[PDB]
Design a protein around this ligand. Structure first.
Ligand SMILES: O=C1Cc2cc(Nc3nc(Cl)ncc3F)ccc2N1
Ligand SMILES: O=C1Cc2cc(Nc3nc(Cl)ncc3F)ccc2N1
Ligand SMILES: [Cl-]
Ligand SMILES: [Cl-]
Lengths: 124, 4, 124, 4
């Protein structure tokens, strides 16, 4: 087509979606990761994660307001990944990289799994 | 704005 | 912080939100623009438009599944702006620029109003 | 991935 494109649009949209999350506006699901609870927007979770895409396209699960993750999932790892979904920034540290990579494999977030594998390889 |  | 950032994340999120819209997945509102109907995600509309942000933060309107726009709004202008919200690309043409600018002023989409004003000024 |  002959469209023009606003370079910062996608980043500005994501910033506004994170402001809605901050302010608990139109959040429609609670993700439970053992004793912790995380409120989020189903559409953002589906857009970032192959696991959430499969969950919320299921004719029965699409209607659930609470999703319980596998008990082996680390809440801090999930929190770091949820923040990445809404900001593009990943708080990857020596002390959390194994939990973050395991969580990203479970959530099916291929680009995160890729950077974790590279950072681990560099330390070996 | 740019030409994509 | 010491975060790393994935450059294409925001664009990839928006692409996936547009794929959900295409496929009518988790759309939660119908915007009526006279005889036409447009299905969308409230969160994407709020993230792009000052008018939708005000509508869906209202304690009564946040619960509506149908929103009727002012009868003066042009459906094609709205369609072009809805596509811009989900893609960052604006189909601005000599034949639609006046309707697009009027719609963007109503929806409170300042960057679109800005490029329309510039394109109009260049033709004068 | 970059340093933001
Ligand atoms: O690593 C990843 C990230 C990821 C996100 C999605 N999300 C969606 N995919 C499509 Cl094709 N349309 C809409 C979506 F919300 C699916 C698979 C995967 N795998
Ligand atoms: O031209 C524009 C585009 C636009 C979008 C929004 N959206 C939100 N703003 C904030 Cl501060 N937090 C969350 C949001 F969804 C508000 C006003 C305006 N004016
Ligand atoms: Cl990813
Ligand atoms: Cl805009």
């Amino acid at each position: 087509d002959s469209c023009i494109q606003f370079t910062r649009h996608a980043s500005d949209v994501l910033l506004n979606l994170n402001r809605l999350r901050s302010r608990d506006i139109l959040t429609d699901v609670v993700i439970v990761v053992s004793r912790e609870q995380f409120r989020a927007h189903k559409t953002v979770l589906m857009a970032c994660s192959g696991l959430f895409y499969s969950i919320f396209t299921d004719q029965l699960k699409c209607n659930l307001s609470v999703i319980n993750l596998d008990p082996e999932i680390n809440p801090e790892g999930f929190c770091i990944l949820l923040d990445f979904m809404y900001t593009s920034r990943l708080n990857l540290r020596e002390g959390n990289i194994m939990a973050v990579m395991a969580t990203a494999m479970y959530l099916q977030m291929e680009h995160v799994v890729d950077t974790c594998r590279k950072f681990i390889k560099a330390s070996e | 704005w740019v030409i994509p």
